[PDB]
Amino acid sequence: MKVRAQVPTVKNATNFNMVADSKTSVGSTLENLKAAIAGETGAHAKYTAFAKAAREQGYEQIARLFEATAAAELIHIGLEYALVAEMEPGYEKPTVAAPSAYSCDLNLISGANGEIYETSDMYPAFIRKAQEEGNSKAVHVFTRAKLAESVHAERYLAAYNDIDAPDDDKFHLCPICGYIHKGEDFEKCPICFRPKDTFTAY
Amino acid sequence: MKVRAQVPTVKNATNFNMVADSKTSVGSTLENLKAAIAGETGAHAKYTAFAKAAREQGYEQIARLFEATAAAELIHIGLEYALVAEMEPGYEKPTVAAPSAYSCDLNLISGANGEIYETSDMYPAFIRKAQEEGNSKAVHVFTRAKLAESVHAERYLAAYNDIDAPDDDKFHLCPICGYIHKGEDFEKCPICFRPKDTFTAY
Ligand SMILES: [Fe+2]
Ligand SMILES: [Fe+2]
Ligand SMILES: [Fe+2]
Ligand SMILES: [Fe+2]
Ligand SMILES: [Fe+2]
Ligand SMILES: [Fe+2]
């Protein structure tokens, strides 16, 4: 993802349209934030399991990508939980069991498919509902997660295409939005402009 | 996609697995070749429509990507048609009507999803059946298409992430397998080793 002159938002970007045949149940923004957290929690468990399998399967770099992406979803959970807690103080984050893992290549595809659903269906739907209800904070959180998921999708497809051609690049994770960069060739996060110095390498 | 010491095949690559819950009806290799051609023909019509819509929407570079990918599918049709013609000289390639094109970002997602289905479901299923029936010619053709589709998927996701950050890079199409590269930084096709100077620029 290239760095634009300005931070991408639903207002200045053109990849925020939602699929017509949605597979997303849309309720109040509160309900949507909870649904997103549940999905994020499932994603974290999924990627954690995929990383474990990747290591057993002999793909150390891909394992690191799954670990970095799992960490990215934890960041999304933190952003969404902070808002939900404010909207419903006693709210308790859900626990999701580790899903089934398959061969590394298939796990990368499974990951990409989920990321695509979130960036083109779920989050855009939630963003528009938040706008409708005037919840600017939710719009911001959903936007950041949405942008990060499409980056995750691309990273997974790149890894799939080069599954037998790994390298020693590290994956740099932005602590603010979950953006992930492969390699050192970058200065800041293209999603939130966070300087590279505060990123964490995987 | 990185260039390896040798061209990728089902014999030396590890991303040829078929998703366990397949959405693909598998018949004889002859039937599968015809089914693949039908899908390729539909993809060509879809990308052609998407390209036209992209230009109307002001996305010149994305339009070029859709045009290059449409051309790539025609290459796949050629490879598959040649094999069918050998067993059934009377076989005629089908023609399909053009589908609707929506907003550019969603068209890129539709493209990516189709590419992912082909590379991780349909082609792996067809390749495996061809192997079980000892049809090496079909294994070869299905492999080339399969490898190109995952590259298409990545190119589409990359364009989606940078939908508002286009550049003047040309897309280079390999005339032999449909591989597509963005920019000039490459020496040969990572799928079939065709030299860069033989590619067609879009
Ligand atoms: Fe996420
Ligand atoms: Fe993600
Ligand atoms: Fe960021
Ligand atoms: Fe194709
Ligand atoms: Fe394709
Ligand atoms: Fe090629």
From Swiss-Prot, chains A, B:
Pfam families: Rubrerythrin, RUBY_RBDX
Protein name, entry field: Nigerythrin
Keywords of this entry: Cytoplasm, Electron transport, Iron, Metal-binding, Transport
InterPro entries in the record: Ferritin-like (IPR012347), Ferritin-like_diiron (IPR009040), Ferritin-like_SF (IPR009078), Nigrythrn (IPR054800), Rbr2/Nigerythrin (IPR052753), Rr_diiron-bd_dom (IPR003251), Rubredoxin-like_dom (IPR024934), RUBY_RBDX (IPR048574)
Gene3D superfamilies, per database record: 1.20.1260.10, 2.20.28.10
Residues holding Fe cation 1: 40, 73, 118, 149
Cellular component per GO, a single term: cytoplasm
PROSITE patterns (UniProt xref): FERRITIN_LIKE, RUBREDOXIN_LIKE
PANTHER family assigned: RUBRERYTHRIN
Name of the gene encoding the protein in the UniProt record: ngr
Domain Ferritin-like diiron span(s) in chain numbering: 23-168
Function text: Exhibits NADH peroxidase activity (in vitro).
Highest rank taxon of the organism: Bacteria
Occurrences of domain Rubredoxin-like (ranges): 169-202
Intracellular or extracellular location(s): Cytoplasm
Main localization of the protein described in the UniProt heading: cytoplasm
MF (Gene Ontology): iron ion binding; oxidoreductase activity
Residues given in the record as Fe cation 3 binding sites: 174, 177, 189, 192
Subunit structure, as described in the record: Homodimer. May possess two rubredoxin-like centers and two hemerythrin-like binuclear-iron centers per dimer.
Positions of Fe cation 2 binding: 73, 115, 149, 152
